[PDB]
Curated annotation (Swiss-Prot), chain A:
Subunit structure: Interacts (via N-terminus) with the capsid assembly scaffolding protein (via C-terminus); capsid proteins and scaffolding proteins form building blocks that assemble to form the procapsid. Interacts with the portal protein.
Protein name: Major capsid protein
Similarity remark: Belongs to the P22 phage major capsid protein family.
From-to range in the entire protein, with total length: 324 to 377 of 430
TM segment ranges: none
Curated annotation (Swiss-Prot), chains B, C, D, E:
Disulfide pattern: none
GO terms for MF: hydrolase activity
Function noted in UniProt: Tail protein that binds the portal ring and functions as a head completion protein. 12 copies of gp4 form a structural ring at the bottom of the portal ring. Together with gp10 and gp26, gp4 is required for stabilization of the condensed DNA within the capsid; perhaps by plugging the hole through which the DNA enters. Plays a role in ejection of the bacteriophage DNA into the host cell at the initiation of infection. Functions as an exolysin that catalyzes the cleavage of the glycosidic bonds between N-acetylmuramic acid and N-acetylglucosamine residues in peptidoglycans.
Biological source species: Salmonella phage P22 (Bacteriophage P22)
UniProt entry tagged with the keyword Hydrolase: yes
Pfam family, any one: P22_Tail-4
The name this protein goes by in its record: Head-to-tail adapter protein gp4
Keywords: Degradation of host cell envelope components during virus entry, Degradation of host peptidoglycans during virus entry, Hydrolase, Late protein, Lyase, Viral genome ejection through host cell envelope, Viral penetration into host cytoplasm, Viral short tail ejection system, Virion, Virus entry into host cell
Subcellular location(s) of the protein: Virion
Cross-referenced InterPro entries: Gp4_sf, Tail_accessory_Gp4
Oligomeric form and interacting partners: Monomer; homododecamer upon binding to the portal ring. Interacts (via C-terminus) with the portal protein; this interaction participates in the head completion. Interacts with the Tail hub protein gp10. Interacts with the tail needle protein gp26.
Length: 54, 152, 152, 152, 152
């Protein structure tokens, strides 16, 4: 399990959170290409959808 | 229904047994009534095997409300006869009595009728095995139809 | 019919039992009627399993009306004999009695006759499965473009 | 539940036997309490064969506590009826009595219901033998070279 | 558990038979108690056939220590009931008695549960005969010239 560690310490009692957004601002977004996926599949031709229709 | 509490069930059972009723001149003591209610609770807990037995809607009394007697049993209209007949059969040995053949037969019939609907509901067919295919009939429709059945 | 209320049903059952009739100079004790009415209501609720049991047209009294006795039972003319014979059989253990063999046989016969028509009605054949073809000879199915039965 | 202690179990058993209850005018005697408590402990220890027998959650009193009477049995609500009916059956010969047929039947039914869930849990299928192929349909095992099942 | 000695076992057997208990007004004599203790010892020696019978953990007292009664039997908590029920059955003859049906049934059930675990342990399968080959599937055994099972 320790092979998956991503932070140096854990949350220890009276620790303060800091909000990194403090003003309204439009977001610029960066990613690795495979980080966001769109799972896609056409709706069944026998579902509640399209079980009556051409 | 005139029977709406555990004590009403107990009194009906005693009337069935012939020990005590409304027209009687000698009655049974409240300690014995509490003992009969305790036996009713034991029988109900034995029937409703923590949800895996006979479902009736019976509500088990808690210790916070002092008298277990006085609480609505919560049974449906069709369960009262079976419940108090079986209770009379169970509490007959208390008063050096043995329940009669009619009472025993009615208790058997009532318990069977109690479990009939639950048996119908629980009679379910298992899903397809994990190694069965879905068939080529379920392939041209729903173009992304699965090739094999999930299971579990 | 001259038996038009739960009171008449109870009195007929008591007379069959020989408890309170005119052939013997015994009048109906007032407490012998309330208990018999309770037993009749319990038996009818047990039979008519919330619509899934024996349909008899019996009208169940509500808590608003004070006297349960005195209401029209609502049974059809062909059910009265079965009803009061079974009531006598059920209420016999109260008086340390036992309904005679003729009364028991009449009760069985009456219950069978009560359920006969309901059984005839419920003997219904299931529709065709969803995987049958309709055949090429089904003109209506061919017209409506139904190569297979719908099932359900 | 009202029955929460070994003393309550013994009182219920004696009441069912009719030896001492408020149905009669007899009161439970301390020597009749202690012997039945010892009998109950022996019977529960026989049932619970160090975990290989009937599981009930019964709490076995240790020698450090002087009075075994009064401690909570720890049984679930669904085991109390079976336990005290079988206790009544077991301690009936002490007073040269014989438990009634209803008590015997209830004891049998309660013991079967006690073991039902444990039987369902213990009805487990053995793993695959050590000499089966894993099959080439399992691509993962085929590539890993897990060609045979472990066993045991 | 309170039945810690052979004397305790004998007293439990007498209480089961109804001959002597703690609530009685007449008791059996110590000579009779010693005779019953000797019958218990004989029964356990007959059961435990010098290691090839029923293993329970019973301890056979020596004549060097004078009183056999008063020595702890050493049985487990689950064997006391069976042992003293069988003792009551064995020693009922002496007082022109006959053990009741419940006592006999409990004795049979207790003996069966006593031997169950020993039977499970003893249900062993003999090794492969001396004339089986090990087979060529065992490559490791083949490379060591282990071509036939040893046997015995």
């Amino acid at each position: 399990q320790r092979a998956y560690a991503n932070v140096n310490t854990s949350l220890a009692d009276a620790m303060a959170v800091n909000i990194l957004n403090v003003k309204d601002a439009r977001t610029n977004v960066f990613w690795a290409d495979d980080a966001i996926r769109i799972v896609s599949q056409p709706i069944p031709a026998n579902h509640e959808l399209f079980a009556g229709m051409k | 229904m005139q029977i709406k509490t555990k004590g009403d069930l107990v009194r009906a059972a005693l009337r069935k047994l012939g020990v005590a009723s409304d027209a009687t001149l000698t009655d049974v003591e409240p300690q014995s009534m509490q003992d009969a209610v305790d036996d009713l609770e034991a029988m109900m807990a034995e029937w409703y095997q923590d949800g895996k037995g006979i479902i009736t809607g019976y509500v088990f009394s808690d210790d916070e409300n002092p008298p277990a007697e006085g609480d609505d049993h919560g049974l449906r209209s069709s369960a009262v006869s079976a419940v108090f007949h079986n209770l009379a059969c169970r509490i007959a040995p208390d008063y050096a009595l043995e329940a009669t053949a009619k009472i025993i037969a009615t208790a058997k019939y009532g318990k069977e009728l109690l479990y009939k609907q639950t048996a119908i509901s629980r009679a379910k067919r298992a899903p397809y095995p994990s190694r069965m295919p879905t068939g080529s009939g379920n392939s041209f429709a729903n173009l992304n139809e699965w090739h094999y059945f999930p299971g579990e």
